[PDB]
Amino acid sequence: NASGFYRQEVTKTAWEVRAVYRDLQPVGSGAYGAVCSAVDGRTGAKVAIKKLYRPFQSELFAKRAYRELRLLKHMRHENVIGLLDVFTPDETLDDFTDFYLVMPFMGTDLGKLMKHEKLGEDRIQFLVYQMLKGLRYIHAAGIIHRDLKPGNLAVNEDCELKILDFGLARQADSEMTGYVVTRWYRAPEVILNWMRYTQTVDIWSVGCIMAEMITGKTLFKGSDHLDQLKEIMKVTGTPPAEFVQRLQSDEAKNYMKGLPELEKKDFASILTNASPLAVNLLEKMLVLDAEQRVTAGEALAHPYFESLHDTEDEPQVQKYDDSFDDVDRTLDEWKRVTYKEVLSFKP
């Protein structure tokens, strides 16, 4: 009887995908899953499939995989990756151990684009514009991405961009559980490992990405958390109610209070080939005070984008709801709520 699915060893690990999804090339590995590109037999459409790493290993691993899925399913916007499909080859709830999310595959990302130098000087306003259109929507659903980087900005043939990888994103008013690994593009409050921060952590990351696009050079390097903060101070200057207060750590308080005391370098001299308009937006994105950081919509209303004559409006979107995922559930209860989501997605 026509199975629905075929098996394919890919990097010595067994993928079982729909008969419709053919020609599995591997493209990525993550904490939480591995990604393959594939062609959708129906349409010819290129497609990304994430095989979740052992999602039912624990209550909280199932909870985070459920959260990733529910979020992707929530988010319908040109510049945000969307959920096309989700399936399991397990033929029963009692066998249910692995499941697969299916997004569009744009063809490349920034960073792969920047490595091979192909990122046109003319393409930069339009790419940074699409990131912020995308963020304006993600933030309007009351979500923080928390892990913007070149790798997570997919770009197609015609320089159209989509924000990838929601496996660390969390409701903006909730607790920021989960360790952000990626180092260069994280805001102070991520580096400081705060349990509450705002959506302007994502604006900081955009700043870091824009600068790096313009100069082809990573704005902030850093060995560990505390050093990456030192580097930030070299571009931004030292602040008052931080090094004599909010480091929850005497050793770190001391380090900052006992180092050579220099003040905000002019971005113009770091970004020696940048529009003075561009420099200006970057100075508004790369502020330590998160309340002073420009937000997604504030950024798009900057003069650096005036040339895009696209007023648009403020595309209204529903806020995501924390509450259904925060319901206590055993592992069996998580398998049954997830299997319900798969059945909902049968073709």
Q: Is 35 annotated as a binding residue?
A: yes
Q: Which of 290, 312, 317 is nearest to 130 (CA)?
A: 312
Q: Is 216 annotated as a binding residue?
A: no
- Type of residue found at 47: V
Our measurement of the distance from residue 211's CA atom to the centroid of its chain's CA atoms, rounded to an integer in Å, reads 18
Q: Is 31 annotated as a binding residue?
A: yes
- Type of residue found at 322: D
Give the contacts of 251 (CB within 8 A, at least 6 positions apart).
none
Residue with tokens 């197609």: 156
* Region of residue 57 (left: phi > 0; alpha: psi -120 to 50; beta: else): alpha
Distance, in Å, from the CA atom of 108 to the CA atom of 39, rounded to the nearest integer, reads 15
Selecting among 40, 147, 165, 202, the annotated active-site residue is: 147
Give φ, ψ of 264 to 5 degrees.
-40, 110
Tokens for 333, please give them.
Answer: 């209860």
Q: Write the DSSP symbol of residue 80.
A: B
Are the C-beta atoms of 278 and 213 separated by less than 8 Å?
A: no
Q: Is 34 annotated as a binding residue?
A: yes
Tell me how many helices (H) and strands (E) the chain has: 13, 12
Q: Is 274 annotated as a binding residue?
A: no
Q: Which of 255, 278, 252, 251 is nearest to 267 (CA)?
A: 278
Q: After which residues are there C–N gaps above 2.5 Å in the chain?
A: none
The question of whether 147 is a catalytic residue gets the answer yes
Tokens for 63, please give them.
Answer: 């909870």
Q: Is 33 annotated as a binding residue?
A: yes
Q: Is 30 annotated as a binding residue?
A: yes
Q: Which of 6, 34, 33 is nearest to 25 (CA)?
A: 34
Q: Which residues are annotated as a binding site?
A: 27-35, 50
Q: Which residues are annotated as a binding site for ATP?
A: 27-35, 50
Q: Catalytic residue numbers?
A: 147
